[PDB]
Chain A
Amino acid sequence: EFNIAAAIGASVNYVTGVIARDKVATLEQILWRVLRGNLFFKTVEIEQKNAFIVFSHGDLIIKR
């Protein structure tokens, strides 16, 4: 949601992920900010429990 325009392509760097809650995602954002700087996006979406997370980065940094 966030058809498909940039979710099945290869020209845009998208990173999906499932999490338990936003409290567990805060430690992942603190670890990603402490180990990768301010080169990511911190978002949280409520699910049915689960948590919808989405990260944004470069197309050549998918391995890291």
Chain B
Amino acid sequence: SQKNGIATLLQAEKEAHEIVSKARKYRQDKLKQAKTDAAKEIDSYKIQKDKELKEF
């Protein structure tokens, strides 16, 4: 069992690295999702300010 047990830890290290790569990818996408979910309040506030200025 010298060369047989190395493949189980070798696949588990690749899956554990792929899970950390997927978590880092979701953590990298969370900032763009936060900014894309954050520009809508600036747009809705700019439209309300433009409506409040155009009304006066």
A residues at B contact (CB < 8 Å): 2, 5-6, 9-13, 41, 43, 45, 54, 56, 58-59
Main secondary structure of the interface of A (DSSP, over half): loop
Bound CA–CA A45/B9 (angstroms): 19
List the B side residues contacting A59 at CB < 8 Å.
13, 16-17
Binding site for A on B (CB under 8 A): 2-3, 5-6, 9-10, 13-14, 16-18
Contacts of A13 in B (CB 8 A): 13
| Residues in chain B near residue A54, CB distance under 8 A | 6
B12 to A, closest residue via Cβ: A12
Contact B3 A11 (CB under 8 A): no
